[model samples]
Target: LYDPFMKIFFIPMDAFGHVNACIGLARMLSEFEHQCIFAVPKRWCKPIEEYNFKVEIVKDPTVPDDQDLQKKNGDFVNRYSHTLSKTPREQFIELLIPSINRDIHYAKIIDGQIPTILESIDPDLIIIDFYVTLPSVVNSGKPWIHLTSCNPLNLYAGPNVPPSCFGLSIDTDPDTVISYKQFIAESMKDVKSDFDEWLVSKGVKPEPFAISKSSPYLNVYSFPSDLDYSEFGPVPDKCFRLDHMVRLVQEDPLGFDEKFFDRPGKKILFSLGSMGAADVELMKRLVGILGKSKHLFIVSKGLFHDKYELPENMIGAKFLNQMAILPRVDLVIHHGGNNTFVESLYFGKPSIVLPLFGDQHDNGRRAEDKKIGRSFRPHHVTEDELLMAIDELLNDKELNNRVLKIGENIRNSKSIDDFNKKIEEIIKVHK
Candidate 1:
């Protein structure tokens, strides 16, 4: 369908996975002759700017201009390193509560700023991928779409589905599942209500039992059907599934030493996303065990990359262009972050998921639940167990075929075209 070019504004949360998902969608729409602009906090502007799309800065009153957002990640990892020794419930109490409060605080700030930002940008439509919805977007009288780049479970959980971060399988005991779900609901009830109260005070209505409201026109989410929660019942009528929305960025081929390339094993990309790689000890431990393997490794080392040297079998950078490198690798050793989890499947690369925190645990469990990959606790995986995982991922013919079929489906699907049509319909109806 042909329509006049539209100027669209994208507002993604400050996290890399969310930002990257939006970038992928924006880039795709741009190919159809639409203009895509970003409204992001100062800390996130640089990466979006580098993509050459127009960026409108959204001021965050709390952080100073000169603050190194990178340091904040380092600080988080340092603080979180202590929590690994604690049980999951303890970690949830110690970590998630404070993190939720902080996110809600920023949510209010962004909610207040969005109207002014939207006024200045004057886009034909808006798209947002954030933890919470902003009243300004919904009230702006423009067509806005909600994008959920995390596991769909985060947004689409129900009685039949286990909650988002617990990483429990569907086959898990029903009582355990109920208790876990209740635990999350009880734990977050106060904070969620606090947010709702703030929204109500602002003359905005919050979604029932949810912090975010879906667009009446369309809400988009990404996840392969292989891992989707079918038993959770149908996705809401207002929602659509994108299968995936990974950014298609160009990069030069990975430059590895000739010797490393000519070596005897599969090329496995060892990455824990940026934040997941922040634990220096975990990085060192995994690298040491992986070095013993005959397989070559490409590491996406994070904040503490400089702190440790990679083994001779591995080469690493502080950050790697993962989208470009996924196709080149035989297997991935990742943190099961949303982007990597789906991207690995999209590219037909089986992986060994090392879940660190958050929705990563859910993704890790999905990988194993679907038999597409293996999941391990990043902190406690042994040398033999890790090596076995590597071998199994690389050599299992059935698993390899399964992933390839999924990748083919993703590549060949017309979901993006469907999305474009939906956008066109929304704009036409609005006109």
Candidate 2:
């Protein structure tokens, strides 16, 4: 007998990529006759609800959306936006440390609200795709799935695998790997303890880095099978991988006029997500360099779309619906955000990754390692380097064939079925 209906609750990070992954999962499950609901901050409620799913906004009435909160949030954003100018080592610490601190700040708010949401939804299963986990979710007396949408290396760390976030290639010298590992370990010492103490105070056992623990019921991660690190070793017990979990986005959400594609050469899209694009100066530099290329460019100019003028060969907007644009473009030049990395392959387009921080660097490395694409430093890239990557990636027949085959396979993969069956099994056992 089948358990025909399930009330599934999702607690995803509020960032676009994390939220987007959850949306894809929820949408897929909705097709299988399950009910899906979101417990997210007010800013995310509208976006999630737009897809016709129910939303329970997580907020503390005592903590009004005041100037103090806005300034605090804005300060974090301002610092993060400037990360492109920092050295790679500085970028790692500055990017991730602040992120951990912010999560702690948000943890207090989310932690206060999650209990009430849990009682209200009383979902059959809870799915979480976040860097930090709530004590409420862990203690709610419900089975939950840990959905890791970032690089799997974040969760599955071993000596054999290159550390995530640094973009170090797999063939790097062992000495260099060990040194970087030591630095990472050393850097997290104070922050990790602080987080651990906070967790203990909340009556939850601390994880290695004081981040959330994985679900004992099931753990899910998204990465293409062909690029996966299965060769490194065994994954966690009961862990599963979905080749790619890209959000279902509307086609051509920003209607393009006829002349947009009138330029010569292969079409290229340059998107670095909002975080990378926040460095408006860097965007201008990249655009200036790309303007010299023979190829036409579509830029997803993030925050400061009005701040700069794109070159003659470029058409840009504040945000282009990337899923819509991926198929039409012949090549993609992006910050190696995993979502973009996976989506490019899903469309079989070769990439030139300009990674700024965190797992973006790692994904860039993976792309290069797998011969799917090339990676470069965002700020240090020369015009020649950028143009050469475009030329090489667009014209490589063997690389094109490989990505096309992988894309076809991912499009045809039974991921939705596998995802549904995983939930079904979890429900059956837990029921």
Candidate 3:
């Protein structure tokens, strides 16, 4: 009872707030009568199902118990020691390989779940997040699409360039640039070898798919192209720039008081994202530095420091409708996770990016180079430095106007619709 012409199975990781980008993509694709099934971890089933979409929960054996892992001091010590001992490439693969294996296992379950969902829902395509094992899903002989939640063009680090190139700047120093080049080159080799081995294990002759810089499916990057691309080196042929496609879910009917926007002073949204709770201490110092100059809306699942008393102007909450509240806020301060970063841009709000690890550093650097935001190293950030940066952004009308202009450009880009059509075209040709 299902159409085989256009069925897509979308795979996302189980982390909170991570699925929003994928969900947005799926919703847009639904307009074309393309059934999208979300394959997520078991714990995430209820939350995803609440969206009124078809969801299948696949139990992941690799998810280590967070609480238990925290208790193992010896394990943590050994892991940290090993991580620092090796080269960046070795350290990255040590972290990435297990996750890849899990994705491969998840794909097998999806292959099984496909027939159960609908006898005729033979997926013409598979859409995968960047972190998932795409090759395994592709090995099922189903055409697949790759979606990047982050800026895809900025993957490899190079010379610092202007915002006009891709939409952002590259901020890596000489030493950092060499390190990044070596890191990417080595990691690509490892990914190729690992993927080949996985294919051979599945009894298929491994193709030279990995070494090729070309991506398999049309690459959809959830960011605007006019922002900057100069520092990101040559753009890959398969890469396609797309604007963020976020549809707000009305979780609560009761809205905030009207005075929330009409407040007497400037408003700023502060968040450290999910993984970078360590940066909260730095935020406290920033709060103390800014004093009562602005109204601060801070979001963190963890408790803030007791020593840093909240100013009458500041408010702290476990969570807020970040997208809903961002428009009213003058600035955003957060760990530069891709979703948060783009969401800030979508609302035309300026940002302060303090990157802890991974792509966050790249994101923060890009934001600074683009002149859309400022980047600060979490460990070295001081109250005086933060206050100065904050003052510069809030007071500069020209910079603020530029940010709004960028947002308008992104709004008119029609990246979400473009991405949907691209997927349809790919599937049609392959089918």
Candidate 4:
């Protein structure tokens, strides 16, 4: 076998699941003579390094803890301010430009780490997460590709939405179409102003916008193109769909564990996502209500009530592989997130979504319109309402059948091999 040498660098967000997709992609590419290097924060180095990839920990200085920012009171802004205010400095660097420059600074400290890594391995192409230091790396004049965990919203929207949106939100507004150029302008305005000011103080000029214009050889978007393009506009020429790139840890295929699902009654899985740790009181009430019924399994990452023991039917875990578990259940009750929404559809499961912020509302709306799921606002959801929704999802055979049909369509849509081909084409053209 002739081995063709290709080295690709990956930068992922702080979240483990987000990075997991990149790792999975890297592993797949290895079969085709590609060597993968993961460039991440110091904290991620240890965990990701264990996966047998080259790991480089970049020191980032612009990341600030929440206490460092001035807080104010308002609806969206207040929520943002509070959230940003509370973030640890390390977490902030993974999102903002100030922190990104710190990433570049570290890249420099490592003394041509990128060039040296690329030279030693002599990579033919570079693949980067859209949020990572791609802009900086590209500015350094290297061939690269961009991979998205969700739809490439950055190609169509600005940076104002919280960084968390990268993991959850889908851009759906037909009226708001932001081209890649426009998005960079807006994002630079929001984040680069402070950075530029700091740069001036240090006697340096920011690089030209041309650096931002070096488009990725290919853009790997993780949404089913058909569903997103209708509202988000035409898919860009370089874009390719890789929605099923998520890596599932090996486990026994979901047998209909009768103890968990095959009972005389129905089963509902309730989850508020892995990081939605804010609504503890709401969770307590929600779980308490579900505890009244023997048909529901309220699975959450945290338990809110210490004094009140959970009911026999209610199950709680600090963590569970929801993607693995969703297939075994008949209904999913969730906080509308991109991963959960996509997984539910992939598994032919029906869902009831309660959106709290950002793209959850958009995902919920899409699910309801497609008839794959129903949605409720957070404050408006009550135990009575939830019970009715569960009953409908469980009892309506038509809805379940529709879910299966959708799942079948998604299964036939595209494969990772197709995306790999697209990536090859992009690298060829760019080279």
Candidate 5:
């Protein structure tokens, strides 16, 4: 059981789920001989520290919470914004300079800070969830792997995938393809040129793809192959797939809240994600509507927990250790976050996704297409609709079988062990 000692730096976004995805790999690496240091915001320190991994607060300007910026910040740039009270940021432009700028700006902000952490850690490799941070990692002159927390849209194209959005199954329409391709190329022109210059200036090679698709070493998608649209063409030769990136709470999950076991009818969970929890109005509406259900409702309400009033049948909290409940819950309602999306599948639980914005729209679409769940836009939903979606999911036996089968594949396969093995092999040989 000899393992090579490797020092790896994981650069993840400030968002909670993205960091959790990174934690899954980090914890596995620690079980071997690798040492992992996470360069993230101070907010994530508490969670990262709990695992006993080294944590460093990397300095970068936080995204602004303005309505305009919120829209620009794209999907992951949610939760921290306060625009939820007045106007919801539901405007969609998956391809636009402004939309791309939202991510690029942060990359530039963190560029100076990455070197500081690299200097301190001098890691052999870097694993980045925020793909834009690749330039900084490249500049550090290290071998790296990219861990995608969401459905991968960066430079991934084929017959099955929608060129512009996250969820384009094999049968996407011609009009969408036209509009998506029309703007997609134009969106990256200036951003790539400037960033390419930055990379070249730092003695690094320019990226071959229009977008930050994956690691030059290896691009890792933290999902099963089936959940993604079938790529009719050759995928990047270096791509690797994992069935999940969710972590089982290493601590006592059996000691969950007493109320959890004291369910009424069916057990349902509403995890709108950390960002989704910011929408005060939507959360209230959902809590109210689902209260009508014969089921008990538990919400992992991130930022909105303190603000809302609840019913006797519903419980709301700032955060719930959802992994503990995933296997037991009858159904999940959420914002199509990758963490919860895959977690639900990994636990064989179906979902009712109401995607608001960002990568969620596509994730929700995939869930519906896979028949593991149903989805609708937030505004289009009604109380009757929510209950029906729940009823449909709860009663689908074949859907349950497929969901459990995916989980079974995950449990049976050596994804975690294989990932650790690959990293160990890379580390043992890399100079």
Candidate 6:
């Protein structure tokens, strides 16, 4: 199967979305004969090795708690919690500091390892997650591409964008922008204290923020072009949009796989990605309510396995392979995680987004605005309201056709097949 192989090294950000997008990308790249290798934290070695790739494990000693993380719907006190949905600007900035430092920890450790790793792979290119720093990826002058999988670049959201937390959205006043910029400065003060002195020694001052900084060669978004506000800054000429990088391939298509659903009437899947699953009580309540529906129901209960007493037609599990079900499910109900909502659209599934916090609210708003789904505010939606929304959405032909059209548009894009050609033109280094 080896026509010509180009070794490509990928440095992941230790987050699920960041790591998995590369997995899908590498799988597709493998189809075109490029060998993919990953340089990641030590703890991920096992899972990384599980995939068909060479892994060069770097430093990290975190361990997972031993247990059956699998259950159908057994309710337990929610185990995980992070920045709550629509957190205020100041608290949000403070929360980001810890994650930023963690990334710095990885980047600093990995920076020195690259030269040695490059000696073995002699890679044709180095691909990096957005969280990867310039220093970590700049070994041996190989060409590089930095892909932002979850959040797109919002450093410059143009003159007429909508309201987002940062200085990055529409309707932002100059005073608000100035205040936000100052807040950013305050937030990064720790970064300045840590890296500014070293960077100054090297004549690189005004220390760089983690984002809005990346490989000089190429840039990318793991989403569709329509999602990007076209008015934002100069079109990142070097950018590439690879639809469904979030989509998992190599899985068999799910038709009525019989046992997966209780006897199909119209299928609905309610999954709360990793973060949204933190509300065990809320999810449990949702189960009791939605289970009354006539349709077949499946729940990808994040932490709880099989705990909920469901109506005869409904089912719940700790996990479900979404790719297999996306094409088959008639509707989705859950937190509007950035990737989940987009992935829903890619598969032509209409969603009923229950935005919890952070980007979920904005993502849900976009879905509502674009007529791709219904967004119900978590604090306000009653059981009847949710049921009514779901029922109305089921009969919404316009929304149905728009989502289907979006999926088709994604399918017609030239990005994936023409990836190498674009790389050829943009790549600054080649041997």
Q: Best candidate per lDDT, number? A: 1
Query: Which 10 successive residues of model 5 have the least lDDT summed?
Result: 65-74
Residue pairs clashing in model 5 are none
The C-alpha stretches of model 5 lying farther than 4 A from their native spots are 1-3, 61-90, 94-102, 153-155, 158-161, 164-166, 173-175, 187-209, 231-235, 250-257
Model 3 — which ten-residue stretch has the worst lDDT? 160-169
Local distance difference test, each candidate: 0.80, 0.78, 0.60, 0.57, 0.69, 0.65
Q: Report the error of model 1 at residue 294, Å.
A: 1.7
Question: Candidate 3 residues 131-201, lDDT tens each?
Answer: 53444455556677677776554434224422111222245356655555555556556666766675566
The regions of model 6 sitting more than 4 angstroms off are 1-4, 49-51, 64-91, 132-134, 153-169, 195-212, 250-258, 292-294, 306-313, 426-431
- Taking the tens digit of each residue's C-alpha lDDT, what string does model 1 give over 176-283? 877887787788788888888888888888777667787888999888765677766676578888888878773424444445556676799888876877788888
lDDT of 6 at 261: 57
Model 5's alpha-carbon lDDT is 0.69
Worst 10 residues of 2 by lDDT: 65-74
The worst-scoring run of ten residues by lDDT in candidate 1 lies at 250-259
TM-score of each: 0.92, 0.92, 0.76, 0.70, 0.84, 0.83
Which lDDT tens digits does candidate 5 get at residues 294-389?
Answer: 888777765545678778777656666677777777888888888888888777787888876556777877787777788887655878888887
lDDT of 6 by residue, 234-295 (tens): 54666666766854653422323447654648888888775456466677677767876666
Q: lDDT score, residue 329, model 3?
A: 81
lDDT of 2 by residue, 1-431 (tens): 79378999988876667877888788778889899999877666666777888999888443443323123333455567776657667876877787877766777678878888788778899998878767887888888998888877766565655677887776667688778778876888887787778778889898764366878888888888888886666666778888888776543366355467666668998988755676777888988899889888888876656789988788888667777778889999988888888889999999898887788878877888889999888788888888988898888999999999999887778877877877888788773
Q: Once superposed on the true structure, which residue ranges of model 1 sit more than 4 Å away at CA?
A: 1-3, 64-69, 172-177, 250-264
For every candidate in turn, the CA RMSD to the true structure comes to: 2.8, 3.2, 5.9, 7.6, 4.8, 4.4
Give the clash count for each candidate.
Answer: 0, 0, 8, 3, 0, 12
- Predictions ranked by lDDT, top down? 1, 2, 5, 6, 3, 4
